[PDB]
Amino acid sequence: MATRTQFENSNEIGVFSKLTNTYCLVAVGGSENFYSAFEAELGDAIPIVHTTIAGTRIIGRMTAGNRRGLLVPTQTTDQELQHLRNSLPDSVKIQRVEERLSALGNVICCNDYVALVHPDIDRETEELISDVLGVEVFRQTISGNILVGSYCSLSNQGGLVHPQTSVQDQEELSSLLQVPLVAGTVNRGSSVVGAGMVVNDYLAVTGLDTTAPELSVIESIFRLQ
Amino acid sequence: MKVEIDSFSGAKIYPGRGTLFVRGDSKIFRFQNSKSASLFKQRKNPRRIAWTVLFRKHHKKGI
Amino acid sequence: SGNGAQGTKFRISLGLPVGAIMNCADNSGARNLYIIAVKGSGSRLNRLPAASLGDMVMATVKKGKPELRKKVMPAIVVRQAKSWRRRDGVFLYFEDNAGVIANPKGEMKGSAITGPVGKECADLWPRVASNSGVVV
Amino acid sequence: SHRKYEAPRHGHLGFLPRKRAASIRARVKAFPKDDRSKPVALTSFLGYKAGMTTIVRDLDRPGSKFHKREVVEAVTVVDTPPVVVVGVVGYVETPRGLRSLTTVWAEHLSDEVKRRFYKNWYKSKKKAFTKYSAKYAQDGAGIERELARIKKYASVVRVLVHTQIRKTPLAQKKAHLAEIQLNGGSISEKVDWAREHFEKTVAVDSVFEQNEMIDAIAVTKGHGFEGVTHRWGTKKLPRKTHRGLRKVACIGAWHPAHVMWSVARAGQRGYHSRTSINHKIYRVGKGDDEANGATSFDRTKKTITPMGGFVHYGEIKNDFIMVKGCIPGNRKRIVTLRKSLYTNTSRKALEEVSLKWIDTASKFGKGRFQTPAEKHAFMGTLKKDL
RNA sequence: CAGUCAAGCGUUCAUAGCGACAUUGCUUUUUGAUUCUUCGAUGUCGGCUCUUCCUAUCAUACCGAAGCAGAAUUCGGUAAGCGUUGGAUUGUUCACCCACUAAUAGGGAACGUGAGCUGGGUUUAGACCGUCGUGAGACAGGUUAGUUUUACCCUACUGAUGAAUGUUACCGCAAUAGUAAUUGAACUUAGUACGAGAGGAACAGUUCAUUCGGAUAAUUGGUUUUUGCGGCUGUCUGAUCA
RNA sequence: UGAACAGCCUCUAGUUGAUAGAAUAAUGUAGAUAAGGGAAGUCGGCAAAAUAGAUCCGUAACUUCGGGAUAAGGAUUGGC
Ligand SMILES: [Mg+2]
Ligand SMILES: [Mg+2]
Ligand SMILES: [Mg+2]
Ligand SMILES: [Mg+2]
């Protein structure tokens, strides 16, 4: 399933949510339908944490997540950090990042094995990503889009990239990430695919205005069947 | 609460005190008062202003 | 703001009246935006309609590309440079006035934002938070 | 002809006339409505405004964007020594309104309350209530006939109380005396409570408690004669205006051939009695206690007084009320704090408030330190300290 | 500006909404008509500022009717409590566009308001052009430059004292007078009711905001004769210190 | 001091005359400063602000070839 969901009318689910294999994060100011989608589809096996990052309802663009670790900005308060430490399982590691770009979901596009980052990140932050997430890192842009997290949706099975992407960039990124990539649109043609939707190994959640060919492209590239 | 440090003088900043300034290169500065804020805007070096923590650390005064 | 607001906004000190020229932060090829109107502003005799951070305005491109000049379009203020207070009581300000171009529903005409944006704007507009590099 | 552009009226017509108040202590024009089921308690209290400070607390509003997040708010401090009960009075109700019929005083009156009955205290024989105390020290003869008179009549019982001005840093020495309504029990229970509490002190926590919405009645800060531009907020006339520009241009039409009362004009600004409602109590502090300024999260033993004392006031050695926001009147002024006239739910009047940190830095400048121990620890040793 | 009548329109159907041919009115924000008052002079455009009043109600409150399924809209009632904006051009009133908004309703008060302002226009004397005139000169034709006086009196209004009520002091009562709050958005209800679909509400609840008002100065900003501290120029006190 | 019988301070000489005292309300007259915006004000940028000396670099259209021109636009300046 690519599950049709709105955040109070918003068809961008990746902005307000962060979904990994092991956990899920949702914003505190959410509707009953928005919570019920993650509660029904994810089930009781996977914890869902209602969280606020840096005083903001936006959490997907603020944080970058992995099954092994979670990265939070510097502006995240101690109460939010302690609540995430209690609510999250003991396996994941939560570490604050002290870096100027500070919006880790926009900066970092990552999965379990390999990650794409903004080219201009600091070397200490790159080593921190490689340490906490245990993930090999490449500094690359998707056809000149420096915000790889906003302009790519990535999982273990496959990836969706920006629609206006050069084909040569598509095989280059596909060989670099060792996963097949498809250029496509989400939410009735919105270009920002990573902000448009969240995905993991068995679930994808998207906006209600995402059309049927777009949803078919999603389930084909992410192998959710 | 959190007690922040003055970006110019190193003084302790209590909640609701002073000002904050986000520069165009996305760097955050925090000023405890208008005196240190105005010295920052006048582009003085805190290594040469005699009452700052960075000056006293440089000059080994009370260290 | 008005239609495309995702939630409400606390009152930010108004810093951009009508006639203000702000930098154009996105990559749409426009250089500055000239504010002619503020969405949701009230009516008072002689009072100029002023804008704050996170507000949607009506603006014209005074300097930039000729297909963007000589027409009115909606814009969103992302940097204010007039100091305002949050409910945790820090007084903060950027060093320039800056906004991006959008449609009336709020999605950006451009694709990337240079420089910081305010969290009071990023929470209120998700597309701005999507294309934003750093949110403070 | 008609006005070309509409605009709202400058100023509020219900706060007229903007004259000086009759006294420096504002009158309580209305008390909370009585019900004869609760125990006997006062409806109000007297204190002295000391100054303002900030706190940090965790906001609890389920639905706000700042839910479960720290906010910093401005509070004002009212120094409240325990008030001294001297006297009760009863009011019968006539077709021309309420009317007092008797007043029964306490026996021993202190000097600070009997200074209220004098303009030249230093040259006096101090003969005040001397024949009244001579009416006392019998068995009961001239006393409980007036008390049973208040029981037999007098549908409203009010208590004469007076502050303890000598416990405050003020240099006045002459206490303030007031009537406070009792709002519990029957008439006999009210006057029995008063008779038992003659010459006794009543503390502020007996009448107030935390998270209570109260009203402040006080006379505002005076400003003397003021022009129309700041007194009423009218628009300044343009720069090239002959004969001045802080004025109102048209003060009326040709007809009616008089200046109307509704036209804004120059005169006295400030020193008006005001009643400001719905102020939440954050802390009822005890003066017989160190760590008044400490919370459960801060836990550093410091009193509520800032560094260098409150500016123009002094110390807070007595009990105090920390109340949210601004109240009318300036520092060192008598202020009457009153219970609310109605029950407010509002999901804001019912919020339970627990403070996290109280500011005790100096208000006589940009204070950097909360305690002298913290200042000494930060700055190290000085030349004056050996 | 409003009636009455009803041939017609409105698929059908006078009157949901309209309505010809007629005919009865009201108003004094039009323009005339008249010449009563003022020629020993009532300062004649417009704008700015400010108060109050009227209702023939643009919006907001509660309702009735529909060619009212919902959404949007139209007609009407009680209603003047409350509001009715920012600009480009023009001296303008008016107009015409841009835009926001719940809405950008109409008017009066000596065509409100010049010892309140302004002086762009008109409306002196300088000057130019066009037309007219032999000429001096003329032109609600165009253009440019052109002194805006006085309140200290009485009343009114805003504030401030105060004799006399045996004296003085404290605490009060309340006749009368005034009065104040206003409007919107988002979430949810709910893609629900309704509908064939396109579309698409409302009540209760929550969080904010606009306009207004009364205070206040903990914080932030402004202000500096704290001439408080430091720096700098020129000169003077022989130099130094000051 | 400085280009200078400019402005500012001093020497010789000459005055110390102009009803005064006490407080520091409004409105004035004269002098000033203002966050963010920058003519949205107004008939109209009225008024105020900004620029300013000197040295070096650089200087357009047009022209009656003489100019425009300090065009515009940049950099520097103390003490030892
Ligand atoms: Mg105006
Ligand atoms: Mg008028
Ligand atoms: Mg009108
Ligand atoms: Mg202070």
mmCIF file of N, CA and C (backbone and C1' of nucleotides) in Angstrom, chain E residues 40-63:
data_model
loop_
_atom_site.group_PDB
_atom_site.id
_atom_site.type_symbol
_atom_site.label_atom_id
_atom_site.label_comp_id
_atom_site.label_asym_id
_atom_site.label_seq_id
_atom_site.Cartn_x
_atom_site.Cartn_y
_atom_site.Cartn_z
ATOM 1 P P G E 40 -22.253 98.894 3.647
ATOM 2 O "O5'" G E 40 -20.834 99.180 4.297
ATOM 3 C "C5'" G E 40 -20.315 98.368 5.347
ATOM 4 C "C4'" G E 40 -19.962 99.213 6.539
ATOM 5 C "C3'" G E 40 -20.541 98.725 7.851
ATOM 6 O "O3'" G E 40 -19.597 97.855 8.438
ATOM 7 C "C1'" G E 40 -20.629 101.114 7.665
ATOM 8 P P A E 41 -19.906 96.320 8.571
ATOM 9 O "O5'" A E 41 -19.570 95.748 7.126
ATOM 10 C "C5'" A E 41 -20.588 95.160 6.306
ATOM 11 C "C4'" A E 41 -20.210 93.753 5.924
ATOM 12 C "C3'" A E 41 -19.407 92.983 6.971
ATOM 13 O "O3'" A E 41 -19.817 91.631 6.992
ATOM 14 C "C1'" A E 41 -18.270 92.939 4.931
ATOM 15 P P U E 42 -21.294 91.259 7.375
ATOM 16 O "O5'" U E 42 -21.134 89.823 8.031
ATOM 17 C "C5'" U E 42 -20.562 89.633 9.330
ATOM 18 C "C4'" U E 42 -20.251 88.172 9.530
ATOM 19 C "C3'" U E 42 -19.257 87.577 8.542
ATOM 20 O "O3'" U E 42 -18.573 86.474 9.097
ATOM 21 C "C1'" U E 42 -21.246 86.388 8.406
ATOM 22 P P G E 43 -17.045 86.584 9.488
ATOM 23 O "O5'" G E 43 -16.293 86.199 8.142
ATOM 24 C "C5'" G E 43 -16.582 84.988 7.429
ATOM 25 C "C4'" G E 43 -15.929 85.030 6.070
ATOM 26 C "C3'" G E 43 -15.737 83.694 5.380
ATOM 27 O "O3'" G E 43 -16.900 83.337 4.658
ATOM 28 C "C1'" G E 43 -13.735 84.934 5.259
ATOM 29 P P U E 44 -17.396 81.839 4.659
ATOM 30 O "O5'" U E 44 -17.647 81.560 3.116
ATOM 31 C "C5'" U E 44 -16.575 81.121 2.275
ATOM 32 C "C4'" U E 44 -17.093 80.901 0.881
ATOM 33 C "C3'" U E 44 -16.173 80.113 -0.038
ATOM 34 O "O3'" U E 44 -16.408 78.709 0.048
ATOM 35 C "C1'" U E 44 -16.703 82.160 -1.061
ATOM 36 P P C E 45 -15.180 77.692 -0.078
ATOM 37 O "O5'" C E 45 -15.096 77.429 -1.641
ATOM 38 C "C5'" C E 45 -16.003 76.520 -2.266
ATOM 39 C "C4'" C E 45 -15.243 75.558 -3.133
ATOM 40 C "C3'" C E 45 -14.755 74.297 -2.450
ATOM 41 O "O3'" C E 45 -15.788 73.328 -2.374
ATOM 42 C "C1'" C E 45 -13.009 75.204 -3.728
ATOM 43 P P G E 46 -15.836 72.292 -1.166
ATOM 44 O "O5'" G E 46 -14.526 71.415 -1.385
ATOM 45 C "C5'" G E 46 -14.407 70.526 -2.509
ATOM 46 C "C4'" G E 46 -12.975 70.089 -2.678
ATOM 47 C "C3'" G E 46 -12.363 69.366 -1.492
ATOM 48 O "O3'" G E 46 -12.743 67.994 -1.378
ATOM 49 C "C1'" G E 46 -10.856 71.008 -2.250
ATOM 50 P P G E 47 -12.980 67.326 0.077
ATOM 51 O "O5'" G E 47 -11.510 67.035 0.608
ATOM 52 C "C5'" G E 47 -10.615 66.218 -0.128
ATOM 53 C "C4'" G E 47 -9.186 66.461 0.282
ATOM 54 C "C3'" G E 47 -8.854 66.168 1.732
ATOM 55 O "O3'" G E 47 -8.601 64.795 1.959
ATOM 56 C "C1'" G E 47 -7.999 68.283 1.152
ATOM 57 P P C E 48 -9.173 64.068 3.267
ATOM 58 O "O5'" C E 48 -8.157 64.491 4.411
ATOM 59 C "C5'" C E 48 -6.765 64.284 4.252
ATOM 60 C "C4'" C E 48 -5.981 65.086 5.253
ATOM 61 C "C3'" C E 48 -6.379 64.890 6.700
ATOM 62 O "O3'" C E 48 -5.836 63.712 7.262
ATOM 63 C "C1'" C E 48 -6.126 67.195 6.258
ATOM 64 P P U E 49 -6.726 62.799 8.229
ATOM 65 O "O5'" U E 49 -6.976 63.714 9.499
ATOM 66 C "C5'" U E 49 -5.939 63.996 10.423
ATOM 67 C "C4'" U E 49 -6.414 64.967 11.467
ATOM 68 C "C3'" U E 49 -7.587 64.500 12.306
ATOM 69 O "O3'" U E 49 -7.180 63.703 13.400
ATOM 70 C "C1'" U E 49 -7.991 66.694 11.526
ATOM 71 P P C E 50 -8.011 62.400 13.802
ATOM 72 O "O5'" C E 50 -9.296 62.974 14.534
ATOM 73 C "C5'" C E 50 -9.170 63.742 15.717
ATOM 74 C "C4'" C E 50 -10.453 64.453 16.051
ATOM 75 C "C3'" C E 50 -11.709 63.608 16.050
ATOM 76 O "O3'" C E 50 -11.859 62.813 17.206
ATOM 77 C "C1'" C E 50 -12.130 65.640 14.937
ATOM 78 P P U E 51 -12.773 61.503 17.137
ATOM 79 O "O5'" U E 51 -14.223 62.027 17.511
ATOM 80 C "C5'" U E 51 -14.442 62.706 18.731
ATOM 81 C "C4'" U E 51 -15.697 63.536 18.703
ATOM 82 C "C3'" U E 51 -16.989 62.816 18.390
ATOM 83 O "O3'" U E 51 -17.499 62.054 19.468
ATOM 84 C "C1'" U E 51 -16.932 64.862 17.231
ATOM 85 P P U E 52 -18.396 60.760 19.175
ATOM 86 O "O5'" U E 52 -19.819 61.344 18.769
ATOM 87 C "C5'" U E 52 -20.621 62.048 19.703
ATOM 88 C "C4'" U E 52 -21.683 62.860 19.009
ATOM 89 C "C3'" U E 52 -22.738 62.073 18.263
ATOM 90 O "O3'" U E 52 -23.772 61.606 19.109
ATOM 91 C "C1'" U E 52 -21.931 63.800 16.878
ATOM 92 P P C E 53 -24.584 60.279 18.732
ATOM 93 O "O5'" C E 53 -25.594 60.747 17.595
ATOM 94 C "C5'" C E 53 -26.588 61.719 17.867
ATOM 95 C "C4'" C E 53 -27.156 62.318 16.606
ATOM 96 C "C3'" C E 53 -27.873 61.368 15.674
ATOM 97 O "O3'" C E 53 -29.185 61.073 16.105
ATOM 98 C "C1'" C E 53 -26.474 62.800 14.423
ATOM 99 P P C E 54 -29.852 59.667 15.741
ATOM 100 O "O5'" C E 54 -30.233 59.802 14.207
ATOM 101 C "C5'" C E 54 -31.160 60.779 13.767
ATOM 102 C "C4'" C E 54 -31.353 60.695 12.281
ATOM 103 C "C3'" C E 54 -31.634 59.306 11.754
ATOM 104 O "O3'" C E 54 -32.990 58.942 11.913
ATOM 105 C "C1'" C E 54 -30.032 60.380 10.381
ATOM 106 P P U E 55 -33.382 57.452 12.340
ATOM 107 O "O5'" U E 55 -33.372 56.663 10.966
ATOM 108 C "C5'" U E 55 -34.031 57.197 9.827
ATOM 109 C "C4'" U E 55 -33.569 56.544 8.553
ATOM 110 C "C3'" U E 55 -33.709 55.025 8.524
ATOM 111 O "O3'" U E 55 -34.248 54.609 7.279
ATOM 112 C "C1'" U E 55 -31.489 55.648 7.981
ATOM 113 P P A E 56 -35.632 53.806 7.262
ATOM 114 O "O5'" A E 56 -35.685 53.183 5.807
ATOM 115 C "C5'" A E 56 -35.704 54.028 4.671
ATOM 116 C "C4'" A E 56 -34.688 53.607 3.646
ATOM 117 C "C3'" A E 56 -33.247 53.562 4.139
ATOM 118 O "O3'" A E 56 -32.530 52.565 3.420
ATOM 119 C "C1'" A E 56 -33.462 55.206 2.448
ATOM 120 P P U E 57 -32.469 51.056 3.961
ATOM 121 O "O5'" U E 57 -30.988 50.906 4.511
ATOM 122 C "C5'" U E 57 -29.878 50.948 3.626
ATOM 123 C "C4'" U E 57 -28.839 49.910 3.969
ATOM 124 C "C3'" U E 57 -29.247 48.459 3.730
ATOM 125 O "O3'" U E 57 -28.117 47.724 3.275
ATOM 126 C "C1'" U E 57 -28.650 48.753 5.994
ATOM 127 P P C E 58 -27.882 47.478 1.708
ATOM 128 O "O5'" C E 58 -26.513 46.675 1.661
ATOM 129 C "C5'" C E 58 -25.654 46.744 0.537
ATOM 130 C "C4'" C E 58 -24.219 46.552 0.948
ATOM 131 C "C3'" C E 58 -23.990 45.600 2.108
ATOM 132 O "O3'" C E 58 -24.015 44.236 1.733
ATOM 133 C "C1'" C E 58 -22.750 47.573 2.463
ATOM 134 P P A E 59 -24.537 43.127 2.768
ATOM 135 O "O5'" A E 59 -23.401 43.061 3.875
ATOM 136 C "C5'" A E 59 -22.128 42.513 3.577
ATOM 137 C "C4'" A E 59 -21.194 42.632 4.750
ATOM 138 C "C3'" A E 59 -21.648 41.953 6.027
ATOM 139 O "O3'" A E 59 -21.348 40.573 6.033
ATOM 140 C "C1'" A E 59 -20.892 44.136 6.514
ATOM 141 P P U E 60 -22.376 39.526 6.673
ATOM 142 O "O5'" U E 60 -22.197 39.722 8.238
ATOM 143 C "C5'" U E 60 -20.954 39.457 8.869
ATOM 144 C "C4'" U E 60 -20.949 39.972 10.281
ATOM 145 C "C3'" U E 60 -22.114 39.523 11.145
ATOM 146 O "O3'" U E 60 -21.938 38.229 11.685
ATOM 147 C "C1'" U E 60 -21.796 41.850 11.391
ATOM 148 P P A E 61 -23.152 37.187 11.663
ATOM 149 O "O5'" A E 61 -24.150 37.730 12.775
ATOM 150 C "C5'" A E 61 -23.785 37.733 14.147
ATOM 151 C "C4'" A E 61 -24.967 38.037 15.031
ATOM 152 C "C3'" A E 61 -26.239 37.274 14.716
ATOM 153 O "O3'" A E 61 -26.234 35.975 15.274
ATOM 154 C "C1'" A E 61 -26.743 39.561 15.027
ATOM 155 P P C E 62 -26.765 34.722 14.426
ATOM 156 O "O5'" C E 62 -28.344 34.802 14.582
ATOM 157 C "C5'" C E 62 -28.938 34.821 15.867
ATOM 158 C "C4'" C E 62 -30.348 35.342 15.820
ATOM 159 C "C3'" C E 62 -31.272 34.677 14.823
ATOM 160 O "O3'" C E 62 -31.753 33.429 15.277
ATOM 161 C "C1'" C E 62 -31.560 37.022 14.738
ATOM 162 P P C E 63 -32.228 32.326 14.220
ATOM 163 O "O5'" C E 63 -33.701 32.782 13.844
ATOM 164 C "C5'" C E 63 -34.139 32.776 12.500
ATOM 165 C "C4'" C E 63 -35.217 33.800 12.275
ATOM 166 C "C3'" C E 63 -35.994 33.642 10.986
ATOM 167 O "O3'" C E 63 -37.017 32.673 11.080
ATOM 168 C "C1'" C E 63 -35.338 35.893 11.228
#
